[PDB]
């Protein structure tokens, strides 16, 4: 549920929350997306 070291991996259907550059448009960003990525 964290974005730590995941900011560079793109969309991941298996993960519970996302870290890709468009995740905000999908309301799916992990809560620490901003501070990590």
């Amino acid at each position: 549920e964290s974005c730590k070291g995941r900011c560079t991996e793109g969309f991941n259907v298996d993960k519970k929350c996302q870290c890709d550059e468009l995740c905000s448009y999908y309301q799916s960003c992990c809560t620490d997306y901003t501070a990590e990525c």
Partner: protein, 364 residues
């Protein structure tokens, strides 16, 4: 660097294809911009699709020093010197739920310091809102509504966008009070009235010949701190079409335009212009040999995804350029150089020789 020159050469060749199909229309374009996004696309491609891009660009992004030198150029353009004068964005959008090759993104990130964006094209209106809003917010609100309704559909899987805005601040601005309406002679033999700026200054003003022995003049207009320059280029004789100059005005020539041994005072009269061009890159890229990337089954993007078939549904550049008295929201006999017929302009990044912008002004 070699890659800055190769990237400008490629982008100028693309500009030439665009200008050729433009008729009597104004065009603004970015050679740097199309080189940068096509260089990134090289990473996604394989087989003949990759070969065609690499052959047309004249280098492989994977080769030693190629990517670092492009990153360096990009970083530089974002420097403190750029007073929101250039706002650019390159983006590749792929179908969001398409399985990508293991390790492709970190590898893409290592080379370019961005990623390939992942948007769900099956929700048509939403994807178009997303792409449009992305472009808008990354060009400081200057390029909005890139894609109108029906620009993409449910079967769209891969889209390339490059969007740029330019409004440079002159080293010496044109006094506002010197601006007034003057006659401008169009290539069809008709004459229109247009606002033209005027200043007395010491500019580089050099005469050259084309192979067919037509005389042309190159005027250099530096922006603040000499980082960028606008060059204005035109045949000396009115009867000579602008195309006699476009077809020969290569990256090599431009990067070699240099100072006058002794600069001389002259009164310069130049039209104001505000141009916006949307270029569909497909035909220009196919004319340069890049046909496979557009072909549904032939396209090879197996470096991006080896799960499902992929091809480029759309490849777009949209450029907006503003040329006025200062490039700000502010409010301000020797030989005369009067630009009152169609001309080419080039915006050059001086430390690298990079051709950032290029265009023809057929009617201000």
């Amino acid at each position: 660097s070699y890659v800055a020159h190769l990237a400008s050469d490629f982008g100028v060749r693309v500009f030439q294809q665009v200008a050729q199909a433009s008729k009597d229309r104004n065009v603004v374009f970015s050679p740097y911009g199309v080189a940068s996004v096509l260089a990134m696309l090289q990473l996604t491609t394989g087989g003949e699709t990759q070969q065609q891009i690499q052959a047309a660009m004249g280098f492989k992004i994977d080769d030693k020093g190629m990517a670092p030198a492009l990153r360096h150029l990009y970083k530089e353009l974002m420097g403190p010197w750029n007073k929101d004068e250039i706002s650019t964005t390159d983006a590749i959008f792929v179908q969001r739920d398409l399985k990508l090759v293991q390790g492709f993104m970190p590898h893409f990130f290592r080379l370019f310091r961005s990623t390939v964006k992942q948007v769900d094209f099956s929700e048509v209106e939403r994807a178009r809102f997303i792409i449009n809003d992305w472009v808008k917010t990354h060009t400081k609100g200057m390029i909005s509504h890139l894609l109108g309704t029906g620009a993409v559909d449910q079967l769209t899987r891969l889209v390339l966008v490059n969007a740029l805005y330019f409004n440079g601040q002159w080293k010496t601005p044109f006094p506002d009070s010197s601006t007034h309406r003057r006659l401008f002679h169009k290539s069809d033999g008709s004459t229109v009235s247009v606002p033209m700026m005027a200043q007395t200054n010491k500019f580089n003003y050099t005469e050259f010949t084309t192979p067919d022995g037509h005389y042309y003049d190159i005027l250099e207009l530096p922006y603040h701190g000499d980082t960028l320059s606008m060059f204005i280029a035109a045949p000396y004789e009115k009867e000579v079409p602008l195309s006699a100059l476009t077809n020969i005005l290569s990256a090599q020539l431009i990067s070699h335009w240099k100072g006058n041994m002794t600069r001389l005072p002259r009164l310069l009269v130049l039209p104001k212009f505000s141009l916006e061009t949307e270029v569909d890159l497909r035909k220009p890229l196919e004319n340069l040999g890049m046909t496979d990337m557009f072909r549904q089954f032939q396209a090879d993007f197996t470096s991006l995804s080896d799960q499902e078939p992929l091809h480029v549904a759309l490849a777009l550049q949209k450029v907006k350029i503003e040329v006025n008295e200062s490039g700000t929201v502010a409010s301000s006999a020797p030989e005369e150089i009067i630009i009152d017929r169609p001309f080419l302009f080039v915006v050059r990044h001086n430390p690298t020789g990079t051709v950032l912008f290029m265009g023809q002004v057929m009617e201000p």
